[PDB]
Design a protein around this ligand. Structure first.
Ligand SMILES: CC1=C(/C=C/C(C)=C/C=C/C(C)=C/C(=O)Nc2ccc(O)cc2)C(C)(C)CCC1
Length: 174
């Protein structure tokens, strides 16, 4: 019954970039293929006077060589015709960090407690997603009550990613 076509996914209605600024802690995540961010991830969103949006992220990375380091990443977002879907350019302070450009959709958020984000880096010929990433973010590193949980569990199912997220740890590494 429920479709897994990226184009049919709902996103956050009348998304407000400014109530979205501030510190977001990653509590859970579904990784994409390849190299990614491990744990201890925290993002910081800002908006300038022109209504832009940028962000900086920190997290631990395990190099393919099993190096334990802490990435400082930067991303600039470009607006689209849908206030909740952005094109994100990103890079790291250290050149060895991945550079790239990903779709950045705001699935759901209450601006005050939680956020559900998602990116599909590759579409299968059917319109479903072949390689995706999604973050569950919290304003507070102690979490969400049981009722906010229930809402996040439902959006996850809606993105056809239910059961695929792992809890992310925060231990002060970076
Ligand atoms: C900017 C940031 C976003 C996305 C960041 C991404 C998705 C970072 C990826 C970094 C990686 C994947 C580094 C890596 O490239 N890790 C390694 C591993 C091993 C190695 O040898 C080199 C690098 C997002 C959504 C959080 C919030 C908006 C700000």
């Amino acid at each position: 019954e429920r479709d897994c076509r990226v184009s049919s996914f709902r996103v956050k209605e009348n998304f407000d970039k400014a109530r979205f600024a501030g510190t977001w802690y990653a509590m859970a995540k579904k990784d994409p293929e390849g190299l990614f961010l491990q744990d201890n991830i925290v993002a910081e969103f800002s908006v300038d006077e022109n209504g832009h949006m940028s962000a900086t992220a920190k997290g631990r990375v395990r190099l393919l060589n099993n190096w334990d380091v802490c990435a400082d990443m930067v991303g600039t977002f470009t607006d689209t015709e849908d206030p909740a879907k952005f094109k994100m350019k990103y890079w790291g302070v250290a050149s060895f960090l991945q550079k790239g450009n990903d779709d950045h959709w705001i699935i759901d958020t209450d601006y005050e407690t939680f956020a559900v984000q998602y990116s599909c880096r590759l579409l299968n010929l059917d319109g479903t997603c072949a390689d995706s990433y999604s973050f569950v973010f919290a304003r507070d590193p102690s979490g969400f009550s049981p009722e906010v949980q229930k809402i996040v569990r439902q959006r996850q199912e809606e993105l056809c990613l239910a059961r695929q997220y792992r809890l992310i740890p925060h231990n002060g590494y970076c």
